[PDB]
């Protein structure tokens, strides 16, 4: 575990993370995809061997000794708000299980279902609160990666509010 487990946020490409493992915002089919998934495919393409996994689940595949946790959030274009909310919460609970199993002291995480799976809605708070619910009982240092300037401020504020 980390000596004083923390949450931090950085605005940059998650493929340049300084953590002991990465969470991929994956598709269920283990395809290269777009956005975070494509950056992860270019950096760790070996990790996409047998990475296909259902919505609401996470599947880890090693790239050398570096763990890539493929977490499949729901596409809110297809799911109801109610069923999408349940799958998005579940995906993050499966990430917490994998992070614990791997024994890492740190993890780089994106906000699941906030990009092309958002169904055109702002889900910063929804996705971040499910991340916190899952990760608060882990002792890994969590570093959240985003790409928007206003989102960096809102994530930072939400971390600081809990102290």
To the question of whether residue 73 is assigned a binding role by annotation, the answer is: no
What would the x/- binding string for Cl ion be over residues 6 to 35, using CB under 5 A?
A: ------xx----------------------
Which residue number places its CB atom closest to Cl ion? 115
To the question of whether residue 107 is assigned a binding role by annotation, the answer is: no
CB 67, min distance to Cl ion, A: 21
CA dist., res. 72 & res. 51, Å (int): 10
The single residue among 78, 148, 157, 160 that binds Cl ion, judged by CB under 5 A, is 148
Closest C-alpha among 106, 92, 109 to residue 6: 106
What would the x/- binding string for Cl ion be over residues 91 to 120, using CB under 5 A?
A: ------------------------x-x---
What is Dmax (Cα atoms) for the chain? Answer: 42
**Strand ranges (E), 12-152:** 22-25, 58-63, 66-71, 106-110, 141-146
**E strand or H helix at 10, and its extent?**
strand 7-11
Q: Within a 10 A sphere around the Cβ of 136, how many other Cβ atoms?
A: 12
Backbone torsions φ then ψ of 108, nearest 5 degrees: -95, 125
Is 151 a binder of Cl ion (CB under 5 A)? Answer: yes
Question: 15-36 burial string, b = 16+ CB within 10 Å, else e?
Answer: bebebbbbbbbbbbebeebeeb
Residue count, binding to Cl ion (CB under 5 A): 8
To the question of whether residue 115 is assigned a binding role by annotation, the answer is: yes
To the question of whether residue 27 is assigned a binding role by annotation, the answer is: yes
Residue number with CB closer to Cl ion (115 or 119)? 115
Annotated binding site for ADP-D-ribose: 13, 27, 35, 115-117
Q: Which residues bind Cl ion (CB under 5 A)?
A: 12-13, 115, 117, 146-148, 151
Annotated binding site: 13, 27, 35, 115-117
């Amino acid at each position: 575990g980390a000596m004083a487990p923390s949450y931090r946020v950085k605005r940059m490409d998650i493929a340049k993370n300084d953590e002991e493992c990465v969470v991929n915002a994956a598709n269920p089919r283990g395809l290269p995809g777009d956005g975070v998934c494509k950056a992860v495919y270019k950096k760790w393409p070996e990790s996409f061997k047998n990475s296909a996994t259902p919505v609401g689940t996470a599947k880890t595949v090693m790239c050398g000794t570096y763990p890539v946790i493929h977490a499949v959030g729901p596409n809110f274009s297809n799911y109801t708000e109610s069923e999408g909310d349940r799958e998005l919460a579940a995906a993050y609970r499966e990430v917490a299980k994998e992070v614990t199993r791997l024994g890492v002291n740190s993890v780089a995480i994106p906000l699941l279902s906030t990009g092309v799976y958002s169904g055109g809605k702002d889900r910063l708070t929804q996705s971040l609160n499910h991340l916190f619910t899952a990760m608060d009982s882990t002792d890994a240092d969590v570093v959240i990666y985003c790409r928007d300037k206003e989102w960096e401020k809102k994530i930072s504020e939400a971390i600081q509010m809990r102290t």
